[PDB]
Design an enzyme around this catalytic site. Structure first.
Site, mmCIF file in Angstrom:
data_model
loop_
_atom_site.group_PDB
_atom_site.id
_atom_site.type_symbol
_atom_site.label_atom_id
_atom_site.label_comp_id
_atom_site.label_asym_id
_atom_site.label_seq_id
_atom_site.Cartn_x
_atom_site.Cartn_y
_atom_site.Cartn_z
ATOM 1 N N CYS A 151 23.585 13.265 9.086
ATOM 2 C CA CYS A 151 24.064 12.015 8.488
ATOM 3 C C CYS A 151 25.583 11.939 8.393
ATOM 4 O O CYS A 151 26.206 12.780 7.763
ATOM 5 C CB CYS A 151 23.464 11.833 7.085
ATOM 6 S SG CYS A 151 23.955 10.274 6.279
ATOM 7 N N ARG B 166 27.574 10.736 4.534
ATOM 8 C CA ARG B 166 27.420 11.527 3.319
ATOM 9 C C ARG B 166 28.543 11.469 2.288
ATOM 10 O O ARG B 166 28.421 12.051 1.211
ATOM 11 C CB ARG B 166 27.116 12.981 3.684
ATOM 12 C CG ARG B 166 25.673 13.197 4.149
ATOM 13 C CD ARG B 166 25.439 14.639 4.571
ATOM 14 N NE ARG B 166 26.038 14.930 5.869
ATOM 15 C CZ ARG B 166 26.241 16.153 6.342
ATOM 16 N NH1 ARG B 166 25.897 17.216 5.619
ATOM 17 N NH2 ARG B 166 26.775 16.319 7.545
ATOM 18 N N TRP C 200 23.096 1.782 4.438
ATOM 19 C CA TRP C 200 23.504 0.605 5.196
ATOM 20 C C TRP C 200 23.829 1.089 6.597
ATOM 21 O O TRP C 200 24.058 2.279 6.814
ATOM 22 C CB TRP C 200 24.701 -0.117 4.561
ATOM 23 C CG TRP C 200 25.874 0.736 4.249
ATOM 24 C CD1 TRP C 200 26.808 1.209 5.124
ATOM 25 C CD2 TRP C 200 26.259 1.207 2.955
ATOM 26 N NE1 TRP C 200 27.753 1.944 4.454
ATOM 27 C CE2 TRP C 200 27.441 1.960 3.120
ATOM 28 C CE3 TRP C 200 25.717 1.064 1.669
ATOM 29 C CZ2 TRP C 200 28.098 2.572 2.045
ATOM 30 C CZ3 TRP C 200 26.370 1.675 0.597
ATOM 31 C CH2 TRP C 200 27.548 2.419 0.795
ATOM 32 N N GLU D 27 24.489 1.936 15.630
ATOM 33 C CA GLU D 27 23.056 2.170 15.542
ATOM 34 C C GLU D 27 22.263 1.012 16.133
ATOM 35 O O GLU D 27 21.247 1.215 16.803
ATOM 36 C CB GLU D 27 22.622 2.364 14.087
ATOM 37 C CG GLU D 27 23.162 3.616 13.430
ATOM 38 C CD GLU D 27 22.634 3.784 12.018
ATOM 39 O OE1 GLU D 27 21.468 4.190 11.868
ATOM 40 O OE2 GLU D 27 23.384 3.497 11.059
HETATM 41 C C1 HEM Z 1 25.364 4.693 2.904
HETATM 42 C C2 HEM Z 1 25.092 4.502 4.216
HETATM 43 C C3 HEM Z 1 24.720 5.485 5.138
HETATM 44 C C4 HEM Z 1 25.236 5.546 6.398
HETATM 45 C C5 HEM Z 1 26.322 4.648 6.978
HETATM 46 C C6 HEM Z 1 24.459 6.515 7.137
HETATM 47 C C7 HEM Z 1 24.558 6.677 8.512
HETATM 48 C C8 HEM Z 1 23.721 7.514 9.262
HETATM 49 C C9 HEM Z 1 23.648 7.504 10.714
HETATM 50 C C10 HEM Z 1 24.496 6.648 11.669
HETATM 51 C C11 HEM Z 1 22.627 8.341 11.054
HETATM 52 C C12 HEM Z 1 21.967 8.559 12.419
HETATM 53 C C13 HEM Z 1 20.792 7.599 12.548
HETATM 54 C C14 HEM Z 1 20.117 7.676 13.898
HETATM 55 O O1 HEM Z 1 20.816 7.959 14.892
HETATM 56 O O2 HEM Z 1 18.895 7.436 13.961
HETATM 57 C C15 HEM Z 1 22.110 8.882 9.805
HETATM 58 C C16 HEM Z 1 21.067 9.794 9.752
HETATM 59 C C17 HEM Z 1 20.487 10.298 8.599
HETATM 60 N N1 HEM Z 1 20.864 9.931 7.322
HETATM 61 FE FE1 HEM Z 1 22.384 8.734 6.760
HETATM 62 N N2 HEM Z 1 23.520 7.153 6.318
HETATM 63 C C18 HEM Z 1 23.633 6.470 5.100
HETATM 64 C C19 HEM Z 1 22.715 6.634 4.053
HETATM 65 C C20 HEM Z 1 21.689 7.596 4.010
HETATM 66 C C21 HEM Z 1 20.898 7.842 2.818
HETATM 67 C C22 HEM Z 1 20.883 6.969 1.554
HETATM 68 C C23 HEM Z 1 20.222 9.029 3.055
HETATM 69 C C24 HEM Z 1 19.311 9.702 2.222
HETATM 70 C C25 HEM Z 1 19.076 9.489 0.908
HETATM 71 C C26 HEM Z 1 20.572 9.448 4.398
HETATM 72 C C27 HEM Z 1 19.920 10.487 5.116
HETATM 73 C C28 HEM Z 1 20.031 10.692 6.495
HETATM 74 C C29 HEM Z 1 19.203 11.589 7.259
HETATM 75 C C30 HEM Z 1 18.228 12.624 6.677
HETATM 76 C C31 HEM Z 1 19.463 11.327 8.560
HETATM 77 C C32 HEM Z 1 18.777 11.927 9.779
HETATM 78 C C33 HEM Z 1 17.537 11.099 10.092
HETATM 79 C C34 HEM Z 1 16.873 11.527 11.380
HETATM 80 O O3 HEM Z 1 16.901 12.740 11.669
HETATM 81 O O4 HEM Z 1 16.322 10.657 12.089
HETATM 82 N N3 HEM Z 1 21.473 8.572 4.987
HETATM 83 N N4 HEM Z 1 22.772 8.354 8.700
HETATM 84 N N1 LIG Z 2 22.353 4.106 8.351
HETATM 85 C C1 LIG Z 2 21.125 4.583 8.188
HETATM 86 N N2 LIG Z 2 20.704 4.890 6.962
HETATM 87 N N3 LIG Z 2 20.339 4.742 9.261
HETATM 88 C C2 LIG Z 2 18.957 5.250 9.263
HETATM 89 C C3 LIG Z 2 18.327 5.241 10.667
HETATM 90 C C4 LIG Z 2 18.338 3.830 11.279
HETATM 91 C C5 LIG Z 2 18.214 3.784 12.824
HETATM 92 N N4 LIG Z 2 19.349 4.528 13.452
HETATM 93 C C6 LIG Z 2 18.238 2.329 13.325
HETATM 94 O O1 LIG Z 2 19.138 1.983 14.125
HETATM 95 O O2 LIG Z 2 17.364 1.541 12.923
#
Ligand code: HEM
Ligand SMILES: NC(=[NH2+])NCCC[C@H](N)C(=O)O
Ligand code: HEM
Ligand SMILES: C[C@H](O)[C@H](O)[C@H]1CNc2nc(N)[nH]c(=O)c2N1
Ligand SMILES: C[C@H](O)[C@H](O)[C@H]1CNc2nc(N)[nH]c(=O)c2N1
Ligand SMILES: NC(=[NH2+])NCCC[C@H](N)C(=O)O
Ligand SMILES: [Zn+2]
Lengths: 407, 411
Positions: free
Chosen positions: A106, A109, A278, A283
């Site tokens: 992520c 974070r 968000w 993405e």
């Molecule tokens: C506040 C906004 C947030 C942004 C901008 C963000 C952005 C991202 C991005 C760009 C990815 C890759 C998604 C993909 O390629 O499918 C990601 C993955 C992930 N995020 Fe965040 N995230 C946010 C909030 C969260 C929240 C609230 C959580 C958990 C409570 C979180 C947990 C994770 C996890 C576990 C992954 C990996 C998911 C996977 O392996 O498919 N994220 N995030």
């Molecule tokens: N910013 C996030 N929390 N992303 C969670 C995974 C969403 C996914 N990459 C999509 O394009 O639908």
């Protein structure tokens, strides 16, 4: 033991000691690196619970206190007596926030401490789950001013009474295979879309059909539910210069809410823990829209731009890609829906990484997932060395329910 | 043991068994991945086994494994090692070795060309002037008036570590960099330290933004000597854009021959510390990294201004728009001047075909995803969606410390 990571653009070197607390394996060995692979008992539980409680009390500056020792004995007794235990609300909140803090894939974070945690451990039925989910969607959407949140349902007991959200995300579009052999809608969800039908859903067969929630409570069979359309915020996509862009009839939803992962806290397993934040522009614009296996819209957009698609060296695919992403960002921003571009998000992650290194001794990060799918090297994370390791609490992948459910 | 890799765009699954022949380490452990880390005299004892492994690989390749020729060669080498502490490779084994070092380079996306490598044997070289002559011949041959030909020149192997042959330049052809007193940099910032060394050694720097550096060559462990590559042998391409006539006025250009000259080639335990090799450029190396890295020429702003993009906020993606145009210009210019070059789409597509072929004929293809995926438009190239396994096979190309940090000066 003590490892160092260098940023080749700034020469800044950070030392990582946090990895020394790593518990789970990575999949790699001294002979082979699998960094690009997507998916690499009471006696067992108490140790995990102890590790967790120790970090919790340490975080609240009460390590080795009577309260620490007390709770530590209470849980031991509870596990020995009930083969499991229940977390205090404070521990649950701390655990969920840290599972996010520890999510190596992520990039957002820096927002980890700002997470609304909805305790749904009192839930017993699928309708109850639907209610909790609607409330999460409404709270998190906040009329476009998105707020990060997670809803935690009952933990696993005997594996035969697990709560599960069959959807991969709370909000996604359906996919149907047409006679043409082509796919209508989102190919990524073709299989799930059929299971919904296999259950009774009346698929409108459009290019963007918001899928119904397939909820499973206490191990029972999943039930369908149509998220109040009024609660699903969507954004029509238009370009700030190409008036023909709107003609593509493209749109996307504002709330990304991963719902198929498993949250592990102190050894406990929460198989249903939908969470949302968000979107980062790429993405949707790069992956959801341009992946050959997704909406695969590059050619269409290329033709509308009248680009020379005869030779790859004209970089028409690249030019179109940029335009498609300028639009997505423009559309969300115009409708007042929260969204972040890949430059801003990566800049923030670097800052976060620095904060984490000086306050926690490190930050697990998976370069392969952190570097955006477009313009990689013009974002700071490309030049940032990263160490990937697994820390708990954590969000883990788990098998799809339709491949394990005993109807 | 079998390991599978999947392409998430085609669902094609490949099985790897080649990783079992991997000896060297990766830097990772069962507890930590170091996949994004840039950089995670032998004895008779450890040398004959390394020689045997290689010769076994060589003889198997020519379908003569177990033959008398194979057995005699092993005996000949064993005797040579115990007798002289080292051994000399036959010309054929040197060629086979160099091609496989390329074939095994996990960070190289152009490996579909591995079997097509011109190997120049410079093991009879004894002086820096001799090295200069060999290098001029390599550049002229490789350049081929714009129709680039892959080649490698191999100088004498290391003996006691005190008589190493080294090319101090990081690439045979590169632009000088100069740190100004006001803190700014003229030229290529990546070569400032080396440029300063050249100046100290006597080079008269013209102090421009694109000055081709002189060769600083070390032969037989002696102090390095300066040589100027004949200008007529250095092919360069002025960079212009097919639609933007003002692009040419940016005063940009680049050399056509990419020739890494600071790596070490290990073959059957032997170490060739001076082994410059060249192929041809993939557009993004120049258009994305050399021109747009903040730590290199950093031209994104100047280009963005001319295009008059909304540079007020990052969400306008002006940096991305400018980046694409610059890369369009690089490809257009090279193509227009008939200088070999490949775009990232074509190159990655070919790599996937090469990789699949390797899995099927060799049982695998070690690859570093972090380096294989291009620095722009990552996900619209097939490699982004391809799972890869990274492991080290020999023969191989390895990094070695910069010579100025270890050289014992004789003055
Ligand atoms: C506040 C906004 C947030 C942004 C901008 C963000 C952005 C991202 C991005 C760009 C990815 C890759 C998604 C993909 O390629 O499918 C990601 C993955 C992930 N995020 Fe965040 N995230 C946010 C909030 C969260 C929240 C609230 C959580 C958990 C409570 C979180 C947990 C994770 C996890 C576990 C992954 C990996 C998911 C996977 O392996 O498919 N994220 N995030
Ligand atoms: N910013 C996030 N929390 N992303 C969670 C995974 C969403 C996914 N990459 C999509 O394009 O639908
Ligand atoms: C024929 C065309 C060739 C193309 C298009 C090609 C392309 C590439 C590219 C894009 C890189 C990454 C460069 C960087 O990021 O700095 C690379 C790395 C590499 N290539 Fe190739 N290559 C070719 C020929 C060769 C040849 C002739 C050899 C050796 C005989 C070779 C050996 C390697 C090695 C060892 C690396 C890694 C260098 C490092 O770690 O800095 N390549 N190649
Ligand atoms: C095969 C490879 O691991 C795969 O395509 C990865 C690469 N990096 C990624 N990065 C992000 N953020 N999301 C993804 O889905 C992927 N897919
Ligand atoms: C830190 C990170 O490993 C580093 O920036 C890598 C990433 N990928 C790369 N890929 C290529 N081809 N060349 C490079 O120099 C790099 N640099
Ligand atoms: N295609 C090659 N052989 N490249 C070698 C490395 C060249 C280096 N990336 C440069 O931009 O100068
Ligand atoms: Zn690894």
């Amino acid at each position: 033991r003590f490892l160092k990571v260098k940023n080749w653009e700034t020469d800044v070197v950070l030392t990582d000691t946090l990895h020394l607390k790593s518990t789970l394996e990575t999949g790699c060995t001294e002979h082979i690196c699998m960094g690009s692979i997507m998916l690499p008992t009471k006696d067992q539980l108490f140790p995990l619970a102890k590790e967790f409680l120790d970090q919790y009390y340490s975080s609240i500056k009460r390590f080795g206190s009577k309260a620490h020792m007390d709770r530590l004995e209470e849980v031991n007794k509870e596990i020995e007596s009930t083969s499991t235990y229940q977390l205090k609300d404070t521990e649950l909140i701390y655990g969920a926030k840290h599972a996010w803090r520890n999510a190596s894939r992520c990039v957002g974070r820096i927002q980890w401490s700002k997470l609304q945690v909805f305790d749904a451990r009192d839930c017993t039925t699928a309708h109850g789950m639907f209610n909790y989910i609607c409330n999460h969607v409404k709270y998190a959407t906040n009329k476009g001013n998105l707020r990060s949140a997670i809803t935690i349902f009952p933990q696993r007991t005997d594996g035969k009474h697990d709560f599960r959200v069959w959807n991969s995300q709370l909000i996604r579009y359906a996919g149907y295979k047409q006679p043409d052999g082509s796919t209508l809608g989102d190919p990524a969800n073709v299989q799930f879309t059929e299971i919904c039908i296999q259950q009774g859903w009346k698929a409108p067969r459009g290019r963007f059909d918001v899928l119904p929630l397939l909820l499973q409570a206490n191990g029972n069979d999943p039930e369908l539910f149509q998220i109040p359309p009024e609660l699903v915020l969507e954004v029509p996509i238009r370009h700030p210069k190409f008036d023909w862009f709107k003609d593509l009839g493209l749109k996307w939803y504002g709330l990304p809410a991963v719902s198929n992962m498993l949250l592990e806290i102190g050894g406990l397993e929460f198989s249903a823990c939908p969470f949302s934040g968000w979107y980062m522009g790429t993405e949707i614009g790069v992956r959801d829209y341009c992946d050959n296996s997704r909406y695969n819209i590059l050619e269409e957009v290329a033709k509308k731009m009248d680009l020379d698609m005869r030779k790859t060296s004209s970089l028409w695919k690249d030019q179109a890609l940029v335009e498609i992403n300028i639009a997505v960002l423009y559309s969300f921003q115009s409708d007042k829906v929260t969204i972040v571009d890949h430059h801003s998000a990566t800049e923030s992650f670097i800052k976060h990484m620095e904060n984490e290194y000086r306050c926690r001794g490190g930050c697990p990060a998976d370069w392969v997932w952190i570097v955006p799918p477009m313009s990689g090297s013009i974002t700071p994370v490309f030049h940032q060395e990263m160490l990937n390791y697994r820390l708990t609490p954590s969000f883990e992948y788990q098998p799809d329910p339709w491949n394990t459910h005993v109807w």
